Amino acid sequence: KKPFSVLLMGSDNGRADTIILATANKQQNAVEMVSIPRDTKVDYGNDIGKINASYSNGGPSGTVSAVEKLMPGVPVDYFISINMEGFKDLVDAVGGITVYNDIDLTEVNSKFVKGNITLNGTDALQYVRIRHEDPRGDFGRQDRQRDVIIGIANKVISESIMKAVGDNFQTNMTLTDITSMATNYSSVLKNVDSQELKGEGEMIYSESYGFDLYYFAPDETDLERVINMFKKSLDIT
CATH class of the missing domain: 3.40.630.190 (LCP protein)
Known part of the structure; x- marks a missing residue:
């Protein structure tokens, strides 16, 4: 039962106002969650941005791509947005x-x-x-x-409760996927440690709008601590 990750998202153009990454591990027998602040700065190249805006690009898959770029070592297995x-x-x-x-x-x-x-x-x-x-x-x-x-x-x-929620719920996971998780990783809920990515906020002028916007500069030092923690959570290949 290899450990896996799942990016938890909360929406409300569209945005990912809450972004939580989590890892379940049968061996270690624990859930490890990290909420990355919605204002986390992201380079586009040439143009900066807030991570919550990664939803605009392709819906949720987009954010997944922003979280993976933000965590080069870490792989996102599943996603679930509501x-x-x-x-x-x-x-x-x-x-x-x-x-x-x-x-x-x-x-x-x-x-x-x-x-x-x-x-x-x-x-x-x-x-x-x-x-x-x-x-x-x-x-x-x-x-x-x-x-x-x-x-x-x-x-x-x-369960078929994905009908009562329908359109407001989206996951790359299948019905047989949830099944296997409840029947195999049930234990992983024994120990659950969530934490917040440490960093600092900063005002950087914006060319398009005309003023300073807010961005979160995650601590490069802690970004690794959590990145490696996640790698150790998933047994680095």
């Missing part, structure tokens, strides 16, 4: 997820109490989009993002 509608459905189509909420967030929704809570599509999205209310800042939105993704995955392993 817009927010597709998200809401997906959660309900699986009966709603369940997650451990770290902090009292009842000021956003009475259900966002402490401990394990159950959320339906709408409620899950309201959970994930929280911000000011969570004292943990970006890492906070990051945990919550993670929790919902694993919460959705623990349900999936307990």
Whole structure:
């Protein structure tokens, strides 16, 4: 059971407003996720850009190509993109997820109490989009993002639900693909470590628009740490 990767995407011309790369490994028995910031700078040649805009080129496959260029060593095996509608459905189509909420967030929704809570599509999205209310800042939105993704995955392993979500869901994976994963990599959900690519933001003037835009310069040092980590996650050929 060779380990594999899958680029998780969240949309909303079109853009990839959330980009998460993940690796599952039966041996190591763990999931390794990395959320690359949506503003990550990318060269086109001659013209710079934000990684989230790689969606414009060929839909999702485009972003996949941007993540692979951004991670030369690392190979992206599968991809799965959903817009927010597709998200809401997906959660309900699986009966709603369940997650451990770290902090009292009842000021956003009475259900966002402490401990394990159950959320339906709408409620899950309201959970994930929280911000000011969570004292943990970006890492906070990051945990919550993670929790919902694993919460959705623990349900999936307990299908033709790709009909209830349909058009808002896109994956190069097949039906027999998901099947094999639930029946072989189920264990990989025991250990799940997600982290955010470290770097710095910067304002670089734009010739087309007429002003400075925002870009994220990932730390060259950490980019390798995570690149090699992913290679070690997939057993470098």
